[PDB]
Amino acid sequence: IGRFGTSLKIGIVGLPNVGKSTFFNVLTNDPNESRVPVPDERFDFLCQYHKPASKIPAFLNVVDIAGGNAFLSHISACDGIFHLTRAVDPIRDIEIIHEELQLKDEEMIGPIIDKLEKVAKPEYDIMCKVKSWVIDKPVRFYHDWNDKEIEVLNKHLFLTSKPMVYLVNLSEKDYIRKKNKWLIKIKEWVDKYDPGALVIPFSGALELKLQELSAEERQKYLEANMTQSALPKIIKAGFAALQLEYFFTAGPDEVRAWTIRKGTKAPQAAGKIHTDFEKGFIMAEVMKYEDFKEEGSENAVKAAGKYRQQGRNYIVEDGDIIFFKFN
């Protein structure tokens, strides 16, 4: 479903006084959006290996909804939801936020019947299907769709068609000691009512102390308490939820993550670098990260028969290290 292309955004969503600003602040460290580097082990490896002038990873765009009803205006203006949540208290809360979003959808589906009711034509067929489904359920819970259906769906970008990742905000203590009444029940719920949904705990407090403390004391802190920042796992969760991923260009001058959508084929992949490449492109030279690491160098990868040469019909895969060729 969703918008076309790679210019997506994920939105920070939940009730007030639940850590939104903190959560936003920590990511940062436009005042309502920020781009955050995605952390990646591969990237680091490639970068250490080539020691390039220029290092450029992928980024997540995250929106700290400032502006409900106007609130939902901005949600429709995002491509998925970071459902933030505090730790009855968080389950009532989850049911609420789901309630609003489902109700904003029916409320918009109304006129979409009205205006369509004069059959001048095949679209009318499918909107019923949707309404029928959204007078039960969220759009996304229907894992069966088609080209005709997605077209129409994408016309209105319903709130319940956006994907969702649950973030449970916690006291320093519960994250660290790794047990919390609510996370159990939330996970119970998510399994019952949103199967597959990611639930990721974290502590805004904790994360913010870590911003303040010196990389030295910082490390002493994370050593002492046998714990980790939760952020990297959340940034990746967001990116993954947007259906984004990337490929690499590594060489002595630059290593770079190039964000793409699942299914992007090599010519559109190359067009990210320069738009003449979508047409101008005869093949892509691909090395999987695994092989480059194992074999230990490009000539080793080549010598071992693993430096594959894909044509114009190749779906780039996440992690591919690619030299694109033209003319």
Ligand X SMILES: Nc1ncnc2c1ncn2[C@@H]1O[C@H](COP(=O)(O)OP(=O)(O)CP(=O)(O)O)[C@@H](O)[C@H]1O
Residue 18 binds ligand X, judged by CB under 6 A: yes
Least distance between ligand X and beta carbon 101 (Å): 18
Integer angstrom CA distances of residue 320 from 69, 195, 240, 254: 42, 30, 17, 15
What's the rounded Cα separation, in Å, for the pair 277 and 265?
Answer: 12
Closest residue to bound ligand X by CB: 16
Q: Is 18 annotated as a binding residue?
A: yes
Q: Is 190 annotated as a binding residue?
A: no
Are the C-beta atoms of residues 23 and 203 closer than 8 Å to each other? no
One residue of 4, 7, 17, 223 binding ligand X per CB under 6 A? 17
- The residue count for binding ligand X (CB under 6 A) is 13
Residue 231 binds ligand X, judged by CB under 6 A: no
Q: How many CA atoms lie within 13 A of 174 on its CB side?
A: 17
One residue of 97, 170, 183, 287 binding ligand X per CB under 6 A? 170
What's the rounded Cα separation, in Å, for the pair 196 and 16?
Answer: 26
Least distance between ligand X and beta carbon 186 (Å): 15
Burial class (CB in 10 A: 0-12, 13-18, 19+), 79: buried
For ligand X, which is the closer residue by CB, 17 or 54? 17
Starting at the edge strand that comes first in sequence, how are the strands of the sheet with 10-13 ordered?
33-37, 59-64, 10-13, 81-86, 164-169, 198-202
DSSP 54-100: EEE--EEEEEE-----HHHHHHHTSSSEEEEEE--TTHHHHHHHHHH
Beta strands in 170-243 (DSSP E): 198-202
Q: Is 21 annotated as a binding residue?
A: yes
For ligand X, which is the closer residue by CB, 159 or 170? 170
In this chain, which stretch among 44-52, 169-177, 237-245, 263-271 interacts with ligand X, using CB under 6 A?
Answer: 169-177
Residue 22 binds ligand X, judged by CB under 6 A: yes
Q: Is 19 annotated as a binding residue?
A: yes
What's the rounded Cα separation, in Å, for the pair 43 and 40?
Answer: 5
Q: Which residues pair with 34 in a beta bridge?
A: 62
Residue 16 binds ligand X, judged by CB under 6 A: yes
For ligand X, which is the closer residue by CB, 18 or 152? 18
For ligand X, which is the closer residue by CB, 28 or 275? 28
Least distance between ligand X and beta carbon 209 (Å): 10
Residue 19 binds ligand X, judged by CB under 6 A: yes
Residue 20 binds ligand X, judged by CB under 6 A: yes
Residue 169 binds ligand X, judged by CB under 6 A: yes
The span from the first CA to the last CA of the chain, in angstroms, equals: 36
Residue 204 binds ligand X, judged by CB under 6 A: yes
Annotated binding site: 17-22, 170
* Contacts to ligand X by CB under 6 A: 16-22, 169-171, 203-205
Annotated binding site for Mg(2+): 21
